[PDB]
Swiss-Prot record, chains A, B:
The modification 2',4',5'-topaquinone is found at Y374. Cu cation binds at H423, H425, H584. One of its GO terms (molecular function) is quinone binding. It is an enzyme of class 1 (oxidoreductase). This is Phenylethylamine oxidase. Its EC number is 1.4.3.21. Induction: By phenethylamine. Binds 1 copper ion per subunit. It catalyses: a primary methyl amine + O2 + H2O = an aldehyde + H2O2 + NH4(+); 2-phenylethylamine + O2 + H2O = 2-phenylacetaldehyde + H2O2 + NH4(+).
Length: 620, 620
């Protein structure tokens, strides 16, 4: 009966039925996005209304629509035609991808380019990439994909080893036209294979790894009820899944004595962008909005026991819609388990003679997704001590190019003649805050150095300061690692026993933000990525830092547009958007398949509790 | 056998015998420091000379000595009388700590101060703390400790809950004289207890935690030979232990095919300082050099299986000297084990149809020490992919004071009337580098943003730059998180298959460095802590960033003196000294016993290998 339960297969097929009966799902229609809407503020006063939001594409050229349906009542709430030149194109369809390679295969310009390089067209894979918005006026209002070529020598070959540089094509996937083929000149196609399962490349496998057995003889310490409601070590939350964002956490709360205390209303990765920093016209347009354009949830992997998730694992198998409105289950797409996490607290006291040690553990909720060459793990952690953490694990195969003769300031060499263009992977965590309820505020906290002199005669003093962010115009903040800058979300109307507002402190990794020139298209379309921390006033329709329709949007959508409202955020229902990313200069060690690298952030209680919340943990 | 083996009980007894025979260890002498020295540069074979260095204190007040002994040859190599007012006092003797409370208990000034506060002297514990160097001219050349009082209500009471503010005493621990008692006025002694094992405070203990069993049915994947030589998953190293530094790693190397490739010759935490930022004269002198003044290894805990170290644990029990030269074992003082570390690499390729997942592991070498109220865990990690990481874990009970009525800019409130002065915990890792051998250099690498314009018309390009640090004068560097600054140690004479010098990249956390005014005693004494990275030319007598004798020693020694030599570090035998630390504004959640917080750094291979070094890891 929880309004935060996962979508059922039946709900999705019910959406399909409502749509088709309304005449909105004819044979030329495709569902580009489908997801359940969260309950509105103040909805608990009963009366479930499960609503779904749908983006409908038309492959015949007709206008797309955004449609909201009520599966509870079997109705279309709203159906609005979209002007895509104005508000953006719909997300890339899984089925539109193959289209690029197929169209190019019969194009004379493309065939000429391949023939000059002596490449068999049957062996040429084309990565179907998002187009962005550049100088091509003819592209406005059209659904475009750009294509880069990779040679696959045989069915099981890794095509990423064999990029075809100096060549790029643009295609209109609706009219099925190749609009441009650009050939800037031949580059050798790197010849070494990157087949990481080939014994010739791996060498003899290690026989030195002895098993590590992780078991829970009495089962896990968390409970799962209503399908996706988790309770674990004082924590309470609901695990949602959306085809765009992936795993979403709802209603994160902590049972402190007799009270269930809210902390975060909704936590998600609301966007992730991969901008490339190679100025070659072959790739200078390349920016993947893995979340906004591709939809990371739809490509979530089925996770294997003992392989992807080790120990005592509880799985969720979320359901999503295919292009036609049929429900598809992602079997074992979400892993949930608790992990030992070393020492929690320890002291050996001379005076009392008491030696005390307690161990820590964390609850893990994760999924793994594949976006073309990339594979990402998204992990949320809840710790015994009240810490909340997110970690992204980036792996897969790096996106390759030729390595230019004479070297490059923008590309690293992975193998002979094989390049890897510099790029970033930049995430936005959207945290709809609810510290002890919805009346919250954010302060920026900096360390403050003090000058030796009166009141500080030994020059040892240091302090800190907090600045309240009172309005959205003041709430776009940057990191300052040197001054230990953090941000505290507090509830000015809820105080701890020492009469201080309860709070949680956000600790960022202070990695570089978006490096592109501020006047670039990517800086405008991924404005969120240019600053570390944004705070907005909550609004139903402000879901993504990049807006609803990211694909081929001209820029300025999302956060810059929200912030421009300059709303009061001082003791109000607010949302924190934290930008954090990896800046990737690929190394030889990343080839032919990359070891995981990580980035993330955490929040720790800051006078939220009246004392340590883990004094009741028993000895191991 | 190996010159890097742990000191044995017999060796320590033999050093005692050699010193005795030489007339250097009569009944008035005490061993303040004793440790084995590393072999000299210049190989050997098995022509070993095990040498020990000793600092010898004299309880009658005669000059102490620094002595090097050859235990192999039964000889004194060198013995020098120290002028401590110049070069520094010896580390504090465990036996001197108790002297303070004992002497104060009969001092009329101390008794009067306690009587003014209605405190029973029998219940007043005194934290006997290092003195540093301030304006008290009479202390020059004397061994002083400063005492701060805490009330202990009964034998098992946590005295830290009951600080006695406004009171401090200074004590000469050799002449056994109370030199000063300062009373700045009475403060209420906080009354709430901080007894974290009292069920009244813990409430009923949780019954919700189900067991997590971690076992290795076939034993661990690492081997231990020669007592302390570890081989694990291509890694080779020797685990040393020194009473001052604690665990020291020697000869870290990686077997890459048929070649054992050195990476780091010696890794240690060569100093750690805990400066306090409260300008009250009661504490404004407070700075712990846990390593240099206290010797962290000597207070290493015995680690309990199932509590401190979970899984299949192999222990080392290092031997140290007592104050008289007798050997003492720290049973189970070092834990060694491997643990699962999630996903190593993963890719699901659409074009090839191959789905690939491998798991990661790390080797862990750790110890835990107790310094009064604080307990610190020191953890070294080696990863399958070649990453090396250090992590410090800070816990224990925070150091307390009164909380001033009307608040404080330098102290936080933990409980009614109970304060916790702001402070930092700053570590120095000394990494004697040997990237593919001793011919090394360091480059500072920064991200480079590029301007939109010719050659970058879309404004997407970004790059990086590297600056070789050629001489020590140029090798004192600061963090720049905003520009993604890292430091690469490379070997300009050893190139990978792509003709690039092999390297490792140091990734810092970019936490704040020492906050004290540069004119302070602590800024001079902990000069190393004011900058993030220092590079020196290797020298036998350059061991600690603070010099050999830190206790009551002014500036004049350590890193700032070493760097002045302005030696060539461009393709030479070099040492990297990385400063990293926590800035602690204590929170209510830290009381009455603090949950672990962490800080550290890592190094990742950077074109060290010719491709990923983990292609030979088998499927799980
Ligand atoms: Cl990548
Ligand atoms: Cu990358
Ligand atoms: Cu601290
Ligand atoms: K537009
Ligand atoms: K001998
Ligand atoms: Na909110
Ligand atoms: Na070196």
């Amino acid at each position: 009966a929880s309004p935060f339960r996962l979508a059922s297969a039946g709900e999705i097929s019910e959406v399909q039925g409502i749509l088709r009966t309304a005449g909105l799902l004819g044979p030329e229609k495709r569902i580009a996005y489908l997801g359940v809407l969260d309950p509105a503020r103040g909805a608990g006063s009963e009366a479930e209304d499960r609503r779904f939001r749908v983006f409908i594409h038309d492959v015949s050229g007709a206008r797309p629509q955004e449609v909201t349906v009520s599966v509870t009542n079997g109705t279309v709430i709203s159906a609005v035609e979209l002007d895509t030149a104005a508000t953006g194109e719909l997300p890339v369809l899984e089925e539109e991808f193959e289209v690029v390679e197929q169209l190019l295969a019969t194009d004379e310009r493309w065939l000429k380019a391949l023939a000059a390089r002596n490449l068999d067209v049957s062996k040429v894979r084309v990565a179907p990439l998002s187009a962005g918005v550049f100088e091509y006026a003819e592209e406005r209002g059209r659904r475009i994909l750009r294509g880069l070529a990779f040679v696959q020598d045989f069915p099981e070959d890794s095509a990423w080893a064999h990029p075809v540089d100096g060549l790029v094509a643009y295609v209109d996937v609706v009219s099925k036209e190749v609009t441009r083929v650009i050939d800037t000149g031949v580059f050798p196609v790197p010849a070494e294979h990157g087949n990481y399962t080939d014994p010739e490349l791996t060498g003899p496998l290690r026989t030195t790894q002895k098993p590590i057995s992780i078991t829970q003889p009495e089962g896990p310490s968390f409970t799962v009820t209503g399908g996706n409601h988790i309770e674990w070590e004082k924590w309470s939350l609901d695990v949602g899944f959306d085809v765009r964002e992936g795993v979403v956490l709802h209603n994160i709360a902590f049972r402190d004595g007799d009270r269930l205390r809210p902390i975060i209303n909704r936590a998600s990765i609301a966007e992730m962008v991969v901008p490339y920093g190679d100025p070659s016209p072959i790739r200078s347009w390349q920016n993947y909005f893995d979340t906004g354009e591709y939809l990371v949830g739809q490509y979530a992997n089925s996770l294997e026991l003992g392989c992807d998730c080790l120990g005592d694992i509880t799985y969720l198998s979320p359901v999503i819609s295919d292009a036609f409105g049929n429900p598809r289950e992602i079997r074992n797409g979400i892993c949930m388990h608790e992990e030992d996490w070393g020492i929690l607290a320890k002291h050996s006291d001379l005076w009392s003679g008491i030696n005390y040690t307690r161990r820590n553990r964390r609850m893990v909720i994760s999924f793994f997704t594949t976006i073309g060459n990339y594979d990402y793990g998204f992990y949320w952690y809840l710790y015994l001590d009240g810490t909340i953490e997110f970690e992204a694990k980036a792996t897969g195969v790096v996106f390759t190019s030729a390595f230019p003769e004479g070297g490059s300031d923008n590309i690293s060499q992975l193998a002979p003649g094989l390049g890897a263009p510099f790029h970033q992977h930049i995430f936005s965590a959207r945290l709809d805050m609810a510290i002890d309820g919805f009346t919250n505020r954010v302060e920026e906290e900096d360390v403050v150095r003090q000058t030796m002199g009166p009141g500080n005669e030994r020059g040892n003093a240091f302090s800190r300061k907090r600045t309240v962010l009172t309005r959205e115009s003041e709430a776009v903040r940057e990191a300052d690692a040197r001054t230990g800058r953090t941000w505290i979300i507090s509830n000015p109307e809820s105080k701890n026993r020492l009469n201080e507002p309860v709070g949680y402190k956000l600790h960022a990794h202070n990695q570089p933000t978006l490096l592109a020139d501020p006047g670039s298209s990517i800086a405008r379309r991924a404005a969120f990525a240019t600053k570390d921390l944004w705070v907005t006033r909550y609004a139903d329709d402000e879901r993504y830092p990049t807006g609803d329709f990211v694909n081929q949007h001209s820029g300025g959508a999302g956060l810059p547009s929200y912030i421009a409202q300059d709303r009061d955020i001082d003791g109000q229902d607010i949302v924190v958007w934290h930008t954090f990313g990896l800046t990737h200069f690929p190394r030889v060690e990343d080839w032919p398949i990359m070891p995981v690298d990580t980035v993330g952030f955490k929040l720790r209680p800051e006078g939220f509790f009246d004392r340590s919340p883990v004094l009741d943990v028993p000895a191991n």
